Design a protein around this ligand. Structure first.
Ligand code: HEM
Ligand SMILES: CC[C@H](C)C(=O)O[C@H]1CCC=C2C=C[C@H](C)[C@H](CC[C@@H]3C[C@@H](O)CC(=O)O3)[C@H]21
Length: 386
C-alpha cells in the first residue's frame, strides 16, 4: 500500500508527482487512520468512481484522505458530502440559480472587474505580484457580487477560505475558520431575509423554502469554492503560459481554457474520493464494500489512453474536453460555467494588455501550494515593458 503521493519534481511545477504517475491504474493506498483502500490514476477507472451509484460521498462511509475535516451526518445544506436523494434537493435548487441568464448577465461585470485590475497594474507599474494584483481579487470580487456578500470584508474571507482548503492545518484551526465564516454569513442571511435582492443568495431566499441554516451552509460552500479555484487557475495558468510562450498565440482557441484545466489539474490530492457501498471491480482489482477509493486527477488528466501527447500543454489540441478537472457525476463542479467565463476573460485580457509579461524572478523561485487541496502559486512576481 502506498501513501498518497505528494512531491512535485523541482523544475516540473505543472506535472504530477512522479510517485503518482508511476503507479498502476488502481493501487492499494494507506489512509492516515490505517484504512487500506485505493488510489486510482486511470481515466476510465476515475470515471466509474465518479459516476457509478455504488459509490458514496458520505463521511459516515469514508475514511478521510486527510485527517482534518472542514465541516460543521452532514448538516442541512452541507450538500457536498451528501448522496442522492438528499444531495439532489440542494443540487437542483443551485442549478436553477447557476442559469444561462445569470452567467450571461454577469459577464460584463467580470469584464469590467478584470479590466479595472489591469488598469491598477498599469498604474503601479512593474513588477507586481500577480497573485495579489489580479489572480486573487478578480474572482474574489466576482463571487462576492454573485452571492451579495460585501467585498469590503475580502481580506477576512480570503484568510478563512485558505484555511478551509488547506491540508496543512489542525482540526482546531479549521473549526475556527469555519466558525468565523458561519457566524459572518448567518448574519448576512438574516439581513437579506429583510431586503430582497436578485443575487444568487437573495434568489435562493425568494424562490425556495431553504432554512437560514441551509442558506448559511450553501453560501459558505460557494464562498470557499469561489475564492480557492479560479484564483489558483489564473496564477498557475499564467505561470504555465509564461513557461510555454509559444502557446500564448493559441489562447483564442475554443478549448484553450479546457486545456489549461486538464494540464494543471489544481484539485490535485486524492479528490474526488468515494466509499464503495458494494464490491466493485475496477481495472485489475476488486474494490470491497467499505473501501475508500481516492482519485489522482493530475494523473487521470495525463492518461495516454485518452490524450495525444498528454504531457504537452497544447491549447489547440482536439481532445481537451475529455479532461476530468471538474470531477464527474452528480457532484461534478457546480461553478464550471462561471469559472470558465472568468478564466477566458482573465487570461485573454491579461495577455492582451501586457503582451510582454514575464516572470520577474527565476522560475525556480516560484513557491507552490503543495500543502493546499487546491494547487497553485503562493506568489508570482511579474514584469513587462512599461
Ligand atoms: C476554477 C476552477 C474550478 C475547478 C478546477 C473546480 C473543481 C471542482 C471539482 C473537481 C469538484 C468535484 C469534487 C468532488 O466530486 O469531490 C467540484 C465541485 C464543486 N465546485 Fe468546482 N471547481 C472550480 C470552480 C468552482 C467555482 C468558481 C465554484 C463557485 C461556487 C465552484 C463550486 C463547486 C461546488 C459548489 C462543488 C460541489 C458540487 C456538489 O457536490 O454537488 N467550483 N469543483
Ligand atoms: C470544505 C471546503 C468546501 C466547502 C469544499 O468542500 O470544497 C470542495 C468542493 C468545492 C471546491 C473545492 C476546491 C478545492 C478543494 C479540493 C475543496 C475541498 C478541500 C478539502 C480541504 C480539506 O478538508 C482536505 C480535503 O482534501 O479537501 C473543494
Amino acid at each position: 500500500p502506498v501513501t498518497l503521493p505528494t512531491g512535485r519534481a523541482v523544475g516540473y511545477p505543472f506535472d504530477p508527482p512522479p510517485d503518482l504517475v508511476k503507479l498502476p491504474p488502481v493501487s492499494p493506498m494507506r489512509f492516515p487512520d490505517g484504512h487500506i483502500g485505493w488510489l486510482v490514476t486511470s481515466h476510465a477507472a476515475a470515471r466509474t468512481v465518479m459516476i457509478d451509484p455504488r459509490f458514496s460521498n458520505r463521511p459516515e462511509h469514508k475514511h478521510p484522505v486527510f485527517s482534518v475535516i472542514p465541516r460543521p451526518a452532514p448538516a442541512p445544506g452541507w450538500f457536498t458530502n451528501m448522496d442522492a436523494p438528499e444531495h439532489t434537493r440542494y443540487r437542483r435548487m443551485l442549478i436553477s440559480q447557476f442559469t444561462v441568464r445569470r452567467i450571461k448577465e454577469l459577464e460584463p461585470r467580470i469584464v469590467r472587474i478584470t479590466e479595472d485590475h489591469l488598469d491598477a497594474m498599469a498604474k503601479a507599474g512593474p513588477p507586481v505580484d500577480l497573485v495579489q494584483a489580479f489572480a486573487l481579487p478578480v474572482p474574489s470580487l466576482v463571487i462576492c457580487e454573485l452571492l451579495g456578500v460585501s467585498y469590503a470584508d475580502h481580506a477576512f474571507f480570503q484568510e478563512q477560505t485558505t484555511i478551509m482548503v488547506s491540508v496543512d492545518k489542525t482540526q482546531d484551526e479549521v473549526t475556527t475558520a469555519l466558525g468565523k465564516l458561519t457566524r459572518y454569513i448567518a448574519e448576512l442571511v438574516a439581513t437579506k431575509r429583510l431586503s430582497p435582492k436578485d443575487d444568487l443568495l437573495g434568489s435562493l431566499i425568494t424562490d425556495t423554502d431553504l432554512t437560514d441554516e441551509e442558506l448559511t451552509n450553501i453560501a459558505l460552500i460557494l464562498l470557499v469554492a469561489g475564492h480557492e479555484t479560479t484564483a489558483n487557475m489564473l496564477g498557475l495558468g499564467t505561470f504555465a503560459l509564461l513557461q510555454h510562450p509559444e502557446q500564448i498565440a493559441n489562447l483564442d482557441s475554443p478549448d484553450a481554457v479546457e486545456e489549461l484545466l486538464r494540464y494543471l489539474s489544481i484539485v490535485h490530492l486524492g479528490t474526488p474520493n468515494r466509499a464503495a457501498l458494494e464490491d466493485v471491480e475496477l481495472e485489475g482489482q476488486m474494490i470491497r464494500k467499505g473501501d475508500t477509493v481516492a482519485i489522482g486527477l493530475p494523473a487521470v488528466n495525463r492518461d495516454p489512453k485518452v490524450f495525444d501527447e498528454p504531457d504537452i500543454l497544447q491549447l489547440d489540441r482536439v481532445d481537451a474536453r475529455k479532461h476530468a478537472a471538474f470531477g464527474g457525476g452528480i457532484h461534478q463542479c457546480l461553478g464550471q460555467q462561471l469559472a470558465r467565463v472568468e478564466m477566458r476573460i482573465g487570461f485573454t485580457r491579461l495577455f492582451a494588455r501586457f503582451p510582454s509579461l514575464r516572470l520577474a524572478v527565476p522560475a525556480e523561485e516560484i513557491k507552490l501550494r503543495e500543502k493546499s487541496a487546491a494547487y497553485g502559486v503562493w506568489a508570482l512576481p511579474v514584469a513587462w515593458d512599461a
